[PDB]
C-alpha cells in the first residue's frame, strides 16, 4: 500500500506539430501493447481520492507541459519579472495514460457508484490507467469521463462548506465555442443547448437534494467574487485563452459571451502571465461537458468553484490507487 514514481504513456504521433504531441514524444513512452486488466474476486480495499500521490504526479507533469510547450511572453510575480519569447502553436488535448512502474500495480474500483472514500466491493488491478485528457478548465469540466451508472457526488466533507464538491456528469453535454472573424477580435461566444442543460441541471439538483434529505428547492447562482479565472468559465481553445461568461447557465438555444484575454492568472504559481495577440480568423472548439466544480455557501445555495486544478485530476484519478505487489 505504498507510493512511488509513475511514468506517463500515450499513443502520441511524432510527426504532428500539436503542442501536446511534441512533449509526449520526448517525455512519455508509447502505450502498452497488451492491457493487463485482472479482476480480483472478493477483495475489499479502502480508496481515498484526496490523499493520493497520483494526483500530484499528474499535476507536476502537466505543469512542465504547459511551460515547455505553451510558454508565456511575459510572466509577472510580486517579487520578480521574467520576459521571454512565446511562439504561437496549436493546442488540442490528447489522452495520457499514467502507468505504474515495474514492480507496482494500480488497484481500480470497478463500480460506478463509488463515493470516493471508503471500501470498494469489486476491485480490479491494471498495469496502466486509461487515457485521461489533461484539460485545464475553470468552473466547467470538459473532455472528461462520464459516470457509467448515474450522476455521482464526491467531497471530503459535506458538513464543511469550504471543501469543494465535485460532480461527474451522467450524459456528456456538448458545448460549441467559436470566435468568428468579422473589428474587435476579443468578442466571442459559446453555444449550448437550453433544454439539454436544464435537464442536466435538474438532475444534479435532484442528486444534491438526496445529499440533503429535506430537499429544500435550491437554485444556483454565479460565483460571488474573486479573480476572473474562477468567477467565469475559462479554458484554452485553439491556443488562445477564452474567458466565457457562465451567467446564463446557472439560473431557445443558450449562448454565452466569450472574450480572449491576453493577461491571465496562471495556475502554476502565484502570479500573472501575458501572451501574444490572437490569431486572425475562425477558431473552432467543441467539447463535451462531463461534470462541474461547485462549492456551498454557508448558512442550500451552491456557487461554482474551481481555480485549483488538482481537483480536476482527482475527478479523473478517483478510482485508481498505486500499491505494491503483495
Amino acid at each position: 500500500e505504498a507510493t512511488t514514481t509513475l511514468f506517463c504513456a500515450s499513443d502520441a504521433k511524432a510527426y504532428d506539430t500539436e503542442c501536446h504531441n511534441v512533449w509526449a514524444t520526448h517525455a512519455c513512452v508509447p502505450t502498452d501493447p497488451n492491457p493487463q486488466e485482472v479482476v480480483l474476486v472478493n477483495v475489499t480495499e479502502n480508496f481515498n481520492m484526496w490523499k493520493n500521490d497520483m494526483v500530484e504526479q499528474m499535476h507536476e507533469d502537466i505543469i512542465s507541459l504547459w511551460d515547455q510547450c505553451l510558454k508565456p511572453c511575459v510572466k509577472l510575480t510580486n517579487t520578480s519579472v521574467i520576459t521571454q519569447a512565446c511562439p504561437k502553436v496549436s493546442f488540442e488535448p490528447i489522452p495520457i495514460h499514467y502507468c505504474a512502474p515495474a514492480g507496482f500495480a494500480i488497484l481500480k474500483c470497478n463500480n460506478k457508484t463509488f463515493n470516493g472514500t471508503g471500501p470498494c466491493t469489486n476491485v480490479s488491478t491494471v498495469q496502466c490507467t486509461h487515457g485521461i485528457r489533461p484539460v485545464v478548465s475553470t468552473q466547467l469540466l470538459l473532455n472528461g469521463s462520464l459516470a457509467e451508472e448515474e450522476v455521482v457526488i464526491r467531497s471530503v466533507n459535506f458538513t464543511d462548506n469550504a471543501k469543494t464538491i465535485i460532480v461527474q456528469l451522467n450524459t456528456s453535454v456538448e458545448i460549441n465555442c467559436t470566435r468568428p472573424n468579422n473589428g474587435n477580435m476579443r468578442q466571442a461566444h459559446c453555444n449550448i443547448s437550453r433544454a439539454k442543460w436544464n435537464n442536466t441541471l435538474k438532475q444534479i439538483a435532484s442528486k444534491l437534494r438526496e445529499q440533503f434529505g429535506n430537499n429544500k428547492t435550491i437554485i444556483f447562482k454565479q460565483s460571488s467574487g474573486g479573480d476572473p479565472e474562477i468567477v467565469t468559465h475559462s479554458f484554452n481553445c485553439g491556443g488562445e485563452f477564452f474567458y466565457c461568461n457562465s451567467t446564463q447557465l446557472f439560473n431557445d438555444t443558450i449562448t454565452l459571451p466569450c472574450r480572449i484575454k491576453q493577461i491571465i492568472n496562471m495556475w502554476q504559481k502565484v502570479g500573472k502571465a501575458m501572451y501574444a495577440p490572437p490569431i486572425s480568423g475562425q477558431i473552432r472548439c467543441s467539447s463535451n461537458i462531463t461534470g462541474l466544480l461547485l462549492t456551498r455557501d454557508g448558512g442550500e445555495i451552491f456557487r461554482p468553484g474551481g481555480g485549483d486544478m488538482r481537483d480536476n485530476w482527482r475527478s479523473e484519478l478517483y478510482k485508481y490507487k498505486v500499491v505494491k505487489i503483495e
Partner: antibody
C-alpha cells in the same frame, strides 16, 4: 532461434520505392514494438519509425512523414517498411530493433542490417 | 527541435586510463529514457547502458553511466583494447552525433 533477419541489399534508382522486410523468429511477435533505424555510411544513427505489431498503429518522424509507409504481417511474423521518392540521401544501412514496452527505452535486439544504395 | 550534443568530438586515450564521455541535451530530458550504445567498426550497435545509470543485462561491471538533467556522463575505467570504438548517446528517438574514441600511441 530468436533472430531478427532482414532482407538482402537492394539497388534503386532516383524516385523509385524501396521496401525492406524484417522477420523476427523465436519470440512473441505481437507483444513487442518494432522500430526501424537507418545509418548513412560513416554518419550517426537516425530513428525513422516504429510499428505496433499487435494493433498496427505506426509512428514516423517529421522528416519522413508522407513518403514512408510501414506494414506488418502477423501470419508470417514479419514487418515491412516502404519508403517512396527515394533519393541519394536515403542510401544507408537499415536496421530493425525490438523494444518491449516498459519504463526504460532501449533497443535490445538488432538486425544484421540491409544495405540500400540509391544512385543514377 | 531537441538535439543531443555529444562531447568531446574525438577522444584519444591509452589503455588503463579512465575516460569519461559527456552527452548534453538542450532541454531537460527525462531521467529514465536515456541509453548509451557502442558500435565497433563494421558491426551492429551494442547496447551498453539504459535508463541513464544502469548496466544492461550482461554488460561488464567497469562500464558505469550516471548524471541527470541536461548533462549526462558515460564512464569507462580501465580501458581495454576492445572498448576503443564509437559511442552514441540516444534519448528515445534522437541520437547524438557520435563520439569517436582512439587508442593513444
Amino acid at each position: 532461434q530468436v533472430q531478427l533477419v532482414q532482407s538482402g541489399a537492394e539497388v534503386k534508382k532516383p524516385g523509385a520505392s524501396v521496401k525492406v522486410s524484417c522477420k523476427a523468429s523465436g519470440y512473441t511477435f505481437t507483444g513487442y514494438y518494432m522500430n526501424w533505424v537507418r545509418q548513412a555510411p560513416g554518419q550517426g544513427l537516425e530513428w525513422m519509425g516504429w510499428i505496433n505489431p499487435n494493433s498496427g498503429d505506426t509512428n514516423y518522424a517529421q522528416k519522413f512523414q508522407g513518403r514512408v509507409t510501414m506494414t506488418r504481417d502477423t501470419s508470417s511474423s514479419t514487418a515491412y517498411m516502404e519508403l517512396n521518392r527515394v533519393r541519394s540521401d536515403d542510401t544507408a544501412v537499415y536496421y530493425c530493433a525490438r523494444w518491449d514496452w516498459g519504463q526504460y527505452w532501449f533497443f535490445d535486439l538488432w538486425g544484421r542490417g540491409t544495405l540500400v544504395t540509391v544512385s543514377s | 527541435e531537441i538535439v543531443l550534443t555529444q562531447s568531446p568530438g574525438t577522444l584519444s586515450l591509452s589503455p588503463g586510463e579512465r575516460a569519461t564521455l559527456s552527452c548534453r541535451a538542450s532541454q531537460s530530458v527525462r531521467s529514465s529514457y536515456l541509453a548509451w550504445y557502442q558500435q565497433k567498426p563494421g558491426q551492429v550497435p551494442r547496447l551498453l547502458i539504459y535508463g541513464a545509470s544502469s548496466r544492461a543485462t550482461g554488460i561488464p561491471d567497469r562500464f558505469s553511466g550516471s548524471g541527470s538533467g541536461t548533462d549526462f556522463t558515460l564512464t569507462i575505467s580501465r580501458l581495454e583494447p576492445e572498448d576503443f570504438a564509437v559511442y552514441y548517446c540516444q534519448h528515445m528517438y534522437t541520437f547524438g552525433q557520435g563520439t569517436k574514441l582512439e587508442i593513444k600511441r
